[PDB]
Coordinates of N, CA, C and O in Angstrom, one line a residue:
Chain S
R1 N 0.8 -1.2 0.0 CA 0.0 0.0 0.0 C 0.9 1.3 0.0 O 0.7 2.2 -0.8
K2 N 1.8 1.3 0.9 CA 2.7 2.5 1.0 C 3.6 2.6 -0.3 O 3.9 3.7 -0.7
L3 N 3.9 1.5 -0.9 CA 4.7 1.6 -2.1 C 3.9 2.2 -3.3 O 4.4 3.0 -4.0
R4 N 2.6 1.7 -3.4 CA 1.7 2.3 -4.4 C 1.5 3.8 -4.1 O 1.6 4.6 -5.0
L5 N 1.4 4.2 -2.8 CA 1.2 5.6 -2.4 C 2.4 6.4 -2.8 O 2.3 7.5 -3.4
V6 N 3.6 5.9 -2.5 CA 4.8 6.7 -2.8 C 5.1 6.8 -4.3 O 5.6 7.8 -4.8
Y7 N 4.7 5.7 -5.0 CA 4.9 5.8 -6.4 C 3.9 6.8 -7.0 O 4.3 7.6 -7.9
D8 N 2.7 6.8 -6.6 CA 1.7 7.9 -7.1 C 2.2 9.3 -6.7 O 2.1 10.2 -7.5
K9 N 2.8 9.4 -5.5 CA 3.3 10.7 -5.1 C 4.5 11.1 -6.0 O 4.6 12.3 -6.3
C10 N 5.4 10.2 -6.3 CA 6.5 10.5 -7.1 C 6.0 10.9 -8.5 O 6.6 11.8 -9.2
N11 N 5.0 10.2 -9.0 CA 4.4 10.5 -10.3 C 3.8 11.9 -10.3 O 4.1 12.7 -11.3
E12 N 3.0 12.2 -9.3 CA 2.4 13.5 -9.2 C 3.4 14.6 -8.9 O 3.1 15.8 -9.1
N13 N 4.6 14.3 -8.5 CA 5.7 15.2 -8.1 C 6.3 15.9 -9.3 O 7.1 16.8 -9.2
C14 N 5.9 15.5 -10.5 CA 6.4 16.1 -11.8 C 5.9 17.4 -12.0 O 5.0 17.7 -12.9
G15 N 6.3 18.4 -11.2 CA 5.9 19.8 -11.4 C 7.0 20.7 -11.5 O 7.8 20.9 -10.6
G16 N 7.2 21.4 -12.6 CA 8.3 22.3 -12.9 C 9.5 21.5 -13.3 O 9.9 20.6 -12.6
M17 N 10.2 21.9 -14.4 CA 11.3 21.2 -14.9 C 11.0 19.7 -15.1 O 11.7 18.8 -14.6
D18 N 9.9 19.4 -15.8 CA 9.5 18.1 -15.9 C 10.5 17.2 -16.7 O 10.8 16.1 -16.2
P19 N 11.0 17.6 -17.9 CA 11.9 16.7 -18.6 C 13.2 16.4 -17.8 O 13.5 15.3 -17.5
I20 N 13.9 17.5 -17.4 CA 15.1 17.4 -16.6 C 16.1 16.4 -17.3 O 16.3 15.3 -16.7
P21 N 16.7 16.7 -18.4 CA 17.5 15.7 -19.1 C 18.9 15.5 -18.5 O 19.7 14.9 -19.2
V22 N 19.1 15.9 -17.3 CA 20.4 15.7 -16.6 C 20.6 14.2 -16.3 O 21.7 13.8 -15.9
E23 N 19.6 13.4 -16.4 CA 19.7 12.0 -16.2 C 20.8 11.4 -17.2 O 21.8 10.8 -16.8
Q24 N 20.5 11.5 -18.5 CA 21.5 11.2 -19.5 C 22.7 12.2 -19.5 O 23.8 11.8 -20.1
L25 N 22.5 13.4 -19.0 CA 23.5 14.4 -19.0 C 24.2 14.5 -17.6 O 24.6 15.6 -17.1
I26 N 24.5 13.3 -17.0 CA 25.2 13.3 -15.7 C 26.6 13.9 -15.9 O 27.2 13.7 -16.9
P27 N 27.1 14.7 -14.9 CA 28.4 15.3 -15.1 C 29.5 14.3 -15.2 O 29.4 13.2 -14.8
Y28 N 30.6 14.7 -15.9 CA 31.7 13.9 -16.2 C 33.0 14.7 -16.1 O 33.5 15.3 -17.1
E29 N 18.8 29.8 4.7 CA 19.8 29.7 3.7 C 20.7 28.5 3.9 O 20.6 27.9 5.0
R30 N 21.5 28.1 3.0 CA 22.4 27.0 3.1 C 23.5 27.3 4.1 O 24.0 26.3 4.7
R31 N 23.8 28.6 4.4 CA 24.8 28.9 5.4 C 24.4 28.5 6.8 O 25.2 28.0 7.5
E32 N 23.1 28.7 7.1 CA 22.6 28.3 8.4 C 22.7 26.8 8.6 O 23.0 26.3 9.7
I33 N 22.3 26.0 7.6 CA 22.4 24.6 7.6 C 23.8 24.1 7.8 O 24.1 23.2 8.5
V34 N 24.7 24.8 7.0 CA 26.1 24.4 7.1 C 26.7 24.7 8.5 O 27.5 23.9 9.0
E35 N 26.3 25.8 9.1 CA 26.7 26.1 10.4 C 26.2 25.2 11.5 O 26.9 24.8 12.4
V36 N 24.9 24.8 11.3 CA 24.3 23.8 12.2 C 25.1 22.5 12.1 O 25.3 21.8 13.1
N37 N 25.4 22.1 10.9 CA 26.2 20.9 10.6 C 27.5 21.0 11.3 O 28.0 20.0 11.8
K38 N 28.2 22.1 11.2 CA 29.5 22.3 11.8 C 29.4 22.2 13.3 O 30.2 21.5 14.0
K39 N 28.4 22.8 13.9 CA 28.2 22.7 15.4 C 27.9 21.3 15.8 O 28.4 20.8 16.8
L40 N 27.1 20.6 15.0 CA 26.8 19.2 15.2 C 28.1 18.3 15.2 O 28.3 17.4 16.0
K41 N 28.9 18.6 14.2 CA 30.2 17.8 14.1 C 31.1 18.1 15.2 O 31.9 17.2 15.7
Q42 N 31.1 19.3 15.7 CA 31.9 19.7 16.8 C 31.4 19.0 18.1 O 32.2 18.4 18.8
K43 N 30.1 19.0 18.3 CA 29.6 18.2 19.5 C 29.9 16.7 19.3 O 30.1 16.0 20.3
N44 N 29.8 16.3 18.1 CA 30.1 14.8 17.8 C 31.6 14.5 18.1 O 31.9 13.4 18.6
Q45 N 32.5 15.4 17.8 CA 33.9 15.2 18.1 C 34.1 15.2 19.6 O 34.9 14.5 20.2
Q46 N 33.4 16.1 20.3 CA 33.5 16.1 21.8 C 33.0 14.8 22.4 O 33.6 14.2 23.2
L47 N 31.8 14.3 21.9 CA 31.3 13.0 22.3 C 32.2 11.9 21.9 O 32.3 10.9 22.6
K48 N 32.9 12.1 20.8 CA 33.9 11.1 20.4 C 35.1 11.0 21.3 O 35.5 9.9 21.7
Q49 N 35.6 12.1 21.8 CA 36.6 12.1 22.8 C 36.1 11.5 24.1 O 36.8 10.8 24.8
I50 N 34.8 11.8 24.5 CA 34.3 11.2 25.7 C 34.2 9.7 25.5 O 34.5 9.0 26.5
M51 N 33.8 9.2 24.4 CA 33.7 7.8 24.2 C 35.1 7.2 24.1 O 35.3 6.0 24.5
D52 N 36.1 7.9 23.7 CA 37.5 7.4 23.7 C 37.9 7.2 25.1 O 38.5 6.2 25.5
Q53 N 37.6 8.2 26.0 CA 38.0 8.1 27.4 C 37.2 6.9 28.0 O 37.8 6.1 28.8
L54 N 35.9 6.7 27.6 CA 35.1 5.6 28.2 C 35.7 4.3 27.7 O 35.8 3.4 28.6
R55 N 36.1 4.1 26.5 CA 36.6 2.9 26.0 C 38.0 2.6 26.5 O 38.4 1.5 26.7
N56 N 38.8 3.7 26.8 CA 40.1 3.5 27.5 C 39.9 3.0 28.9 O 40.6 2.0 29.3
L57 N 38.9 3.5 29.6 CA 38.5 3.0 30.9 C 38.1 1.5 30.8 O 38.3 0.7 31.7
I58 N 37.3 1.2 29.8 CA 36.8 -0.2 29.6 C 38.0 -1.1 29.3 O 38.0 -2.3 29.9
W59 N 38.9 -0.7 28.5 CA 40.1 -1.6 28.3 C 40.9 -1.7 29.5 O 41.5 -2.8 29.8
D60 N 41.0 -0.7 30.4 CA 41.7 -0.8 31.6 C 41.0 -1.8 32.5 O 41.6 -2.6 33.2
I61 N 39.6 -1.8 32.6 CA 38.9 -2.7 33.4 C 39.1 -4.1 32.9 O 39.2 -5.1 33.7
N62 N 39.2 -4.3 31.6 CA 39.5 -5.6 31.0 C 40.9 -6.0 31.4 O 41.1 -7.2 31.7
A63 N 41.8 -5.1 31.5 CA 43.2 -5.4 32.0 C 43.1 -5.9 33.4 O 43.7 -6.9 33.8
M64 N 42.3 -5.2 34.3 CA 42.2 -5.7 35.6 C 41.7 -7.1 35.7 O 42.2 -7.9 36.4
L65 N 40.6 -7.4 34.9 CA 40.1 -8.7 34.9 C 41.1 -9.7 34.4 O 41.0 -10.9 34.8
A66 N 42.0 -9.3 33.5 CA 43.1 -10.2 33.1 C 43.9 -10.6 34.4 O 44.4 -11.8 34.4
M67 N 44.0 -9.8 35.4 CA 44.7 -10.1 36.6 C 43.9 -10.9 37.5 O 44.4 -11.3 38.6
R68 N 42.6 -11.2 37.2 CA 41.7 -11.8 38.1 C 42.1 -13.3 38.3 O 42.9 -13.8 37.5
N69 N 41.4 -14.0 39.2 CA 41.7 -15.4 39.5 C 40.5 -16.2 39.1 O 39.3 -15.8 39.3
Chain E
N1 N 38.9 -22.6 66.6 CA 37.7 -21.8 66.3 C 36.7 -21.8 67.4 O 36.8 -21.1 68.4
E2 N 35.7 -22.7 67.3 CA 34.7 -22.8 68.3 C 35.2 -23.5 69.6 O 35.0 -22.9 70.7
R3 N 35.8 -24.6 69.4 CA 36.3 -25.4 70.6 C 37.4 -24.6 71.4 O 37.4 -24.6 72.6
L4 N 38.3 -23.9 70.7 CA 39.3 -23.2 71.4 C 38.7 -22.0 72.2 O 39.1 -21.8 73.4
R5 N 37.8 -21.3 71.6 CA 37.2 -20.2 72.3 C 36.3 -20.7 73.4 O 36.3 -20.1 74.5
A6 N 35.7 -21.8 73.3 CA 34.9 -22.4 74.3 C 35.8 -22.8 75.5 O 35.4 -22.6 76.7
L7 N 36.9 -23.5 75.2 CA 37.8 -23.9 76.3 C 38.4 -22.6 77.0 O 38.6 -22.6 78.2
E8 N 38.7 -21.6 76.2 CA 39.2 -20.4 76.8 C 38.2 -19.7 77.7 O 38.5 -19.3 78.9
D9 N 36.9 -19.6 77.3 CA 35.9 -19.1 78.1 C 35.7 -19.9 79.3 O 35.4 -19.4 80.4
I10 N 35.8 -21.3 79.2 CA 35.6 -22.1 80.3 C 36.7 -21.9 81.4 O 36.4 -21.9 82.6
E11 N 38.0 -21.8 80.9 CA 39.0 -21.5 81.9 C 38.9 -20.1 82.5 O 39.1 -20.0 83.7
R12 N 38.4 -19.1 81.8 CA 38.2 -17.8 82.4 C 37.1 -17.9 83.4 O 37.2 -17.3 84.5
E13 N 36.0 -18.6 83.1 CA 34.9 -18.7 84.1 C 35.3 -19.5 85.3 O 34.9 -19.2 86.4
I14 N 36.2 -20.5 85.1 CA 36.7 -21.3 86.2 C 37.5 -20.4 87.1 O 37.4 -20.4 88.3
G15 N 38.4 -19.5 86.5 CA 39.2 -18.6 87.3 C 38.3 -17.6 88.1 O 38.5 -17.3 89.2
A16 N 37.3 -17.1 87.4 CA 36.4 -16.1 88.0 C 35.6 -16.8 89.2 O 35.5 -16.2 90.2
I17 N 35.2 -18.0 89.0 CA 34.4 -18.7 90.0 C 35.3 -19.0 91.2 O 34.9 -19.0 92.4
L18 N 36.6 -19.4 90.9 CA 37.6 -19.6 92.0 C 37.8 -18.3 92.8 O 37.8 -18.4 94.0
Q19 N 38.0 -17.2 92.1 CA 38.2 -16.0 92.9 C 37.0 -15.6 93.7 O 37.1 -15.2 94.8
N20 N 35.8 -15.8 93.1 CA 34.5 -15.5 93.8 C 34.4 -16.4 95.0 O 34.0 -15.9 96.1
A21 N 34.7 -17.7 94.9 CA 34.6 -18.6 96.0 C 35.6 -18.3 97.1 O 35.3 -18.4 98.3
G22 N 36.8 -17.9 96.7 CA 37.8 -17.5 97.7 C 37.3 -16.2 98.5 O 37.4 -16.2 99.7
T23 N 36.8 -15.3 97.7 CA 36.3 -14.1 98.4 C 35.1 -14.4 99.4 O 35.0 -13.9 100.5
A24 N 34.2 -15.3 98.9 CA 33.1 -15.7 99.8 C 33.6 -16.4 101.0 O 33.0 -16.2 102.1
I25 N 34.5 -17.3 100.8 CA 35.1 -18.1 102.0 C 35.7 -17.1 103.0 O 35.6 -17.3 104.2
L26 N 36.5 -16.1 102.4 CA 37.1 -15.1 103.3 C 36.0 -14.3 104.1 O 36.1 -14.2 105.3
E27 N 35.0 -13.9 103.4 CA 33.9 -13.1 104.0 C 33.2 -13.9 105.0 O 32.7 -13.4 106.0
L28 N 33.0 -15.2 104.8 CA 32.3 -16.1 105.7 C 33.1 -16.4 107.0 O 32.6 -16.3 108.1
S29 N 34.3 -16.9 106.8 CA 35.2 -17.3 107.9 C 35.8 -16.1 108.6 O 36.5 -16.3 109.6
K30 N 35.6 -14.9 108.1 CA 36.2 -13.7 108.7 C 35.4 -13.3 110.0 O 35.9 -13.2 111.1
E31 N 34.1 -13.1 109.8 CA 33.2 -12.7 110.9 C 31.9 -13.4 110.7 O 31.6 -14.0 109.7
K32 N 31.1 -13.3 111.8 CA 29.7 -13.9 111.7 C 28.6 -12.9 111.9 O 28.9 -11.7 112.2
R33 N 27.2 -21.5 112.3 CA 27.5 -21.1 110.9 C 27.9 -22.3 110.1 O 29.1 -22.6 109.9
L34 N 26.9 -23.0 109.6 CA 27.2 -24.2 108.7 C 27.5 -23.8 107.3 O 28.2 -24.6 106.6
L35 N 27.1 -22.6 106.8 CA 27.5 -22.2 105.5 C 29.0 -22.1 105.2 O 29.4 -22.3 104.1
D36 N 29.7 -21.9 106.3 CA 31.2 -21.9 106.2 C 31.7 -23.3 105.6 O 32.8 -23.3 105.1
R37 N 30.9 -24.3 105.8 CA 31.3 -25.6 105.2 C 31.4 -25.5 103.7 O 32.4 -26.1 103.1
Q38 N 30.5 -24.8 103.1 CA 30.6 -24.6 101.6 C 31.9 -23.8 101.3 O 32.4 -24.0 100.2
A39 N 32.4 -23.1 102.2 CA 33.7 -22.4 102.0 C 34.8 -23.4 101.7 O 35.7 -23.1 100.9
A40 N 34.7 -24.6 102.3 CA 35.7 -25.6 102.0 C 35.7 -26.0 100.6 O 36.7 -26.3 99.9
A41 N 34.5 -26.0 100.0 CA 34.3 -26.3 98.6 C 35.1 -25.4 97.7 O 35.6 -25.7 96.6
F42 N 35.3 -24.1 98.2 CA 36.2 -23.2 97.5 C 37.6 -23.8 97.2 O 38.1 -23.7 96.1
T43 N 38.2 -24.4 98.3 CA 39.4 -25.1 98.1 C 39.3 -26.1 97.0 O 40.3 -26.3 96.2
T44 N 38.2 -26.9 97.0 CA 38.0 -27.9 95.9 C 38.0 -27.2 94.5 O 38.6 -27.7 93.6
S45 N 37.5 -26.0 94.4 CA 37.5 -25.2 93.2 C 39.0 -25.0 92.8 O 39.3 -25.0 91.6
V46 N 39.8 -24.7 93.8 CA 41.3 -24.5 93.5 C 41.8 -25.8 92.9 O 42.6 -25.7 91.9
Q47 N 41.4 -27.0 93.4 CA 41.8 -28.2 92.8 C 41.4 -28.3 91.3 O 42.2 -28.8 90.5
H48 N 40.3 -27.7 91.0 CA 39.8 -27.7 89.6 C 40.9 -27.0 88.7 O 41.2 -27.5 87.7
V49 N 41.4 -25.9 89.2 CA 42.5 -25.2 88.5 C 43.7 -26.2 88.3 O 44.3 -26.2 87.2
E50 N 44.0 -26.9 89.3 CA 45.0 -27.9 89.2 C 44.7 -28.9 88.1 O 45.6 -29.3 87.3
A51 N 43.5 -29.3 88.0 CA 43.0 -30.2 86.9 C 43.2 -29.5 85.6 O 43.8 -30.0 84.6
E52 N 42.9 -28.2 85.5 CA 43.2 -27.4 84.4 C 44.7 -27.4 84.1 O 45.2 -27.5 83.0
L53 N 45.5 -27.2 85.2 CA 46.9 -27.4 85.1 C 47.3 -28.7 84.5 O 48.0 -28.8 83.5
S54 N 46.7 -29.8 85.0 CA 46.8 -31.1 84.4 C 46.3 -31.1 83.0 O 46.9 -31.6 82.1
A55 N 45.2 -30.4 82.7 CA 44.7 -30.2 81.4 C 45.7 -29.5 80.5 O 45.9 -29.8 79.3
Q56 N 46.4 -28.5 81.1 CA 47.5 -27.9 80.4 C 48.8 -28.7 80.4 O 49.6 -28.6 79.5
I57 N 48.9 -29.6 81.4 CA 50.1 -30.5 81.5 C 50.0 -31.5 80.3 O 50.9 -31.5 79.5
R58 N 49.0 -32.3 80.4 CA 48.8 -33.3 79.3 C 47.9 -32.7 78.2 O 46.9 -33.3 77.7
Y59 N 48.3 -31.5 77.7 CA 47.7 -30.9 76.6 C 48.3 -31.3 75.3 O 49.1 -32.3 75.3
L60 N 48.1 -30.6 74.2 CA 48.7 -31.0 72.9 C 50.2 -31.0 73.0 O 50.8 -32.1 72.8
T61 N 50.8 -29.9 73.3 CA 52.3 -29.8 73.3 C 52.9 -30.3 72.0 O 53.6 -31.3 72.1
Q62 N 52.6 -29.7 70.9 CA 53.0 -30.2 69.6 C 54.5 -30.4 69.5 O 55.0 -31.5 69.2
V63 N 55.2 -29.3 69.7 CA 56.7 -29.3 69.7 C 57.3 -29.0 71.0 O 58.3 -29.6 71.4
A64 N 56.7 -28.0 71.7 CA 57.3 -27.5 73.0 C 58.7 -27.0 72.9 O 59.4 -26.8 73.9
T65 N 59.1 -26.7 71.6 CA 60.5 -26.2 71.4 C 60.4 -25.1 70.4 O 61.3 -24.2 70.3
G66 N 59.3 -25.0 69.6 CA 59.1 -24.0 68.6 C 57.6 -23.5 68.7 O 56.9 -23.9 69.6
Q67 N 57.2 -22.8 67.6 CA 55.9 -22.2 67.6 C 55.1 -23.0 66.5 O 55.6 -23.1 65.3
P68 N 53.9 -23.4 66.7 CA 53.1 -24.1 65.7 C 52.4 -23.1 64.8 O 52.6 -21.9 64.9
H69 N 51.4 -23.7 64.0 CA 50.6 -22.9 63.1 C 51.5 -22.1 62.2 O 51.4 -20.9 62.1
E70 N 52.3 -22.8 61.4 CA 53.1 -22.2 60.4 C 52.4 -21.4 59.4 O 51.3 -21.9 58.8
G71 N 52.8 -20.2 59.1 CA 52.2 -19.4 58.1 C 51.0 -18.6 58.6 O 50.0 -19.2 59.1
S72 N 51.0 -17.3 58.3 CA 49.9 -16.5 58.7 C 48.7 -16.7 57.7 O 47.6 -16.2 58.0
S73 N 48.9 -17.4 56.6 CA 47.9 -17.6 55.6 C 47.3 -16.3 55.1 O 46.2 -16.3 54.5
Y74 N 48.0 -15.2 55.3 CA 47.5 -13.9 54.8 C 47.7 -13.6 53.3 O 47.5 -12.5 52.9
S75 N 48.0 -14.7 52.6 CA 48.0 -14.6 51.1 C 46.5 -14.2 50.7 O 46.3 -13.4 49.8
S76 N 45.5 -14.8 51.3 CA 44.2 -14.4 51.1 C 43.9 -13.0 51.4 O 43.2 -12.2 50.7
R77 N 44.5 -12.5 52.5 CA 44.4 -11.1 52.9 C 45.0 -10.2 51.8 O 44.4 -9.1 51.5
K78 N 46.2 -10.5 51.3 CA 46.8 -9.8 50.2 C 45.9 -9.8 49.0 O 45.7 -8.7 48.3
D79 N 45.3 -10.9 48.7 CA 44.4 -11.0 47.5 C 43.2 -10.1 47.7 O 42.7 -9.5 46.8
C80 N 42.7 -10.0 49.0 CA 41.6 -9.2 49.3 C 42.0 -7.7 49.1 O 41.2 -6.9 48.6
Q81 N 43.2 -7.4 49.5 CA 43.6 -6.0 49.3 C 43.7 -5.7 47.9 O 43.3 -4.6 47.4
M82 N 44.2 -6.6 47.0 CA 44.2 -6.3 45.6 C 42.8 -6.2 45.0 O 42.6 -5.4 44.2
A83 N 41.9 -7.0 45.5 CA 40.5 -6.9 45.0 C 39.9 -5.6 45.4 O 39.2 -4.9 44.6
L84 N 40.1 -5.1 46.6 CA 39.6 -3.8 47.0 C 40.2 -2.7 46.2 O 39.6 -1.7 45.9
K85 N 41.5 -2.8 45.9 CA 42.2 -1.8 45.1 C 41.6 -1.8 43.7 O 41.5 -0.7 43.1
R86 N 41.4 -3.0 43.1 CA 40.7 -3.0 41.8 C 39.3 -2.4 41.8 O 39.0 -1.7 40.9
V87 N 38.6 -2.6 42.9 CA 37.3 -2.0 43.1 C 37.4 -0.5 43.1 O 36.6 0.2 42.5
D88 N 38.4 0.0 43.9 CA 38.6 1.4 43.9 C 39.0 2.0 42.6 O 38.6 3.1 42.2
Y89 N 39.9 1.3 41.9 CA 40.3 1.8 40.5 C 39.1 1.8 39.6 O 38.9 2.8 38.8
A90 N 38.2 0.8 39.7 CA 37.0 0.8 38.8 C 36.1 2.0 39.2 O 35.5 2.6 38.4
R91 N 36.0 2.2 40.5 CA 35.2 3.4 41.0 C 35.7 4.7 40.4 O 35.0 5.6 40.0
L92 N 37.0 4.8 40.4 CA 37.7 6.0 39.9 C 37.4 6.2 38.4 O 37.1 7.3 37.9
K93 N 37.6 5.1 37.7 CA 37.4 5.2 36.2 C 35.9 5.5 35.9 O 35.6 6.2 35.0
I94 N 35.0 4.9 36.7 CA 33.6 5.2 36.5 C 33.3 6.6 36.8 O 32.5 7.3 36.1
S95 N 33.9 7.2 37.9 CA 33.7 8.6 38.2 C 34.2 9.5 37.1 O 33.6 10.5 36.7
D96 N 35.4 9.1 36.5 CA 35.9 9.9 35.4 C 35.0 9.9 34.2 O 34.7 10.9 33.5
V97 N 34.5 8.7 33.9 CA 33.5 8.5 32.7 C 32.3 9.3 33.0 O 31.7 9.9 32.1
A98 N 31.8 9.3 34.3 CA 30.6 10.1 34.6 C 30.8 11.6 34.5 O 29.9 12.3 34.0
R99 N 32.0 12.1 34.9 CA 32.3 13.5 34.7 C 32.4 13.8 33.3 O 31.9 14.9 32.8
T100 N 33.0 12.9 32.4 CA 33.0 13.2 31.0 C 31.6 13.2 30.4 O 31.3 14.1 29.6
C101 N 30.7 12.3 30.9 CA 29.3 12.3 30.4 C 28.6 13.5 30.8 O 27.8 14.1 30.0
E102 N 28.7 14.0 32.0 CA 28.1 15.2 32.5 C 28.6 16.4 31.7 O 27.8 17.3 31.4
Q103 N 29.9 16.4 31.4 CA 30.4 17.5 30.6 C 29.9 17.4 29.2 O 29.8 18.5 28.5
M104 N 29.5 16.2 28.7 CA 29.0 16.1 27.4 C 27.6 16.7 27.2 O 27.2 17.1 26.1
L105 N 26.9 16.9 28.3 CA 25.5 17.5 28.3 C 25.6 19.0 28.4 O 26.6 19.6 27.9

């Protein structure tokens, strides 16, 4: 059902620049979105360092267990 | 363990009863009487200590030249210290990870 619906939606989506011959012609504001992406990647790098510390502690705990009996 | 502590408590109670019987015999024969006859039993209690002496005489006496119970067996104690140290290290690492996570928010 959803496939039929999305196919009908894609068919009805042909509004403006209908031919768009760039298919056979394949090659051979956005600032706010880019800034949000940069901030997201910065927070992701921070969380990556946090996860690095966490996995370092986890490897340390594994080392302790290596000493276990 | 159980038997040693029991025999020790028995010897301590025997000594306490001997001291109490001696004090009672002194208080009875000092001033004023048939109860003084029981005072003689106090001397018998003294003989009990002699039996304990005999109990100590013909006791184990493993070597009577050295000390028995070789080894403090505190290897387990050292292992427990290492376990507690590992627990503390894990607590410290967990606290560091928690500080990092709180800073992530």
